[PDB]
Each structure stands twice: as C-alpha cells, then as structure tokens.
Amino acid sequence: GPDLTEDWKEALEWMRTSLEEQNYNPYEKPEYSVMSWWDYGNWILYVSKKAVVANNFQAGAVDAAKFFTAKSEDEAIKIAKKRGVRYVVTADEITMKDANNTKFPAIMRIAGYNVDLMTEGEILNFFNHTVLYRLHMENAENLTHFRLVKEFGDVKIFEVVGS
Numbered sequence: 001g002p003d004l005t006e007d008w009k010e011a012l013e014w015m016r017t018s019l020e021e022q023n024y025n026p027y028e029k030p031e032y033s034v035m036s037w038w039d040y041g042n043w044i045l046y047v048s049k050k051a052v053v054a055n056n057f058q059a060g061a062v063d064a065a066k067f068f069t070a071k072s073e074d075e076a077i078k079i080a081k082k083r084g085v086r087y088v089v090t091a092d093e094i095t096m097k098d099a100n101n102t103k104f105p106a107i108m109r110i111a112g113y114n115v116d117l118m119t120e121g122e123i124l125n126f127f128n129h130t131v132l133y134r135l136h137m138e139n140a141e142n143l144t145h146f147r148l149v150k151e152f153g154d155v156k157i158f159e160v161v162g163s
Helices: 006-020 057-068 073-083 104-110 120-128 131-137
Strands: 087-090 146-152 155-160
Touching: 006 087, 006 146, 006 155, 057 073, 057 104, 057 131, 073 131, 073 155, 087 131, 104 120, 120 131, 131 155
Parallel strands: none
Antiparallel strands: 087 155, 146 155
16 A cells, blocks of 8 residues: 555654564564554565564454454453554544544454444444544543553554553
C-alpha cells in the first residue's frame, strides 16, 4: 500500500529506539514487541529477527484484529500477553472517525465479522464498544492494562502495563 506517513515513521523510530536498549537468552524475548495494523507493503520493511513486528504477516493481522475488536479488556490483554507485546499503536485511520476513510471494516473482516451485513450505524455502535475505542477515543483512561505514552500526530503509542 501507500508509504507510511511521517508520523508513523517517527512513531516506529521512537519505539525502535526504546526497544534497542533491551538486553536478553534470545528465547526470553517476546514473539514480537509492537502490535499495530499493518499494510503488507509497509510490514515487509520491518520484519526480521529483531522481532519488532510479527514474523508472519497474516498471524500478526489476526492478532491485531482480534485485539482491537475485543469488547473486554481481559480478552485484549490476553492476546498482548501471549505475544509479549510492549507497545500497541493506534491512529485515526483504524477508527470510525470517517466512515468513508477507515480501515476498521477491514479489521472487523479479518477478526471474522461479516461487517458487510451491517449498516453504517451498526458498525459505529460495534466500534464504540471495543477496546480500540477505549484506547484511541479515551486515551486508555478507562483501561487498567494500557497507558498512553507517546503521540505523533494522531498516531498513539500505548505501553502494556506489566509487559
């Protein structure tokens, strides 16, 4: 897809710098450190044994979709804990800010929802009850396992509490 925006590149650089300081055995290392909604074209530039992003594109997409569409924080944190993710990143693009410019329907599809059988109103209502809503729309104020730690434009970086 299209090249990542400057805010995204900056956010990714801030996280890489924060992760570069880590020292581990290579086996205690998390499956991957950053959970975000990737476009294959962008993801291919970051995948490596550094384990910043998911080794397998599809698995990473399903992980992120299940996480973002979760209705309970307990389900979301379970996914993040399993992969050992330290950062979760959101942006206006994956939310329902603009029904005509959103990747949320795609996220819903990957998560297994038949979004195409839903009205715009139903998709918005669904979105408002997700963990993604509580992250991006409320800056994790009502989430106990996630803390907003950095922002670059509308790209928000959340740190998993207890990772």
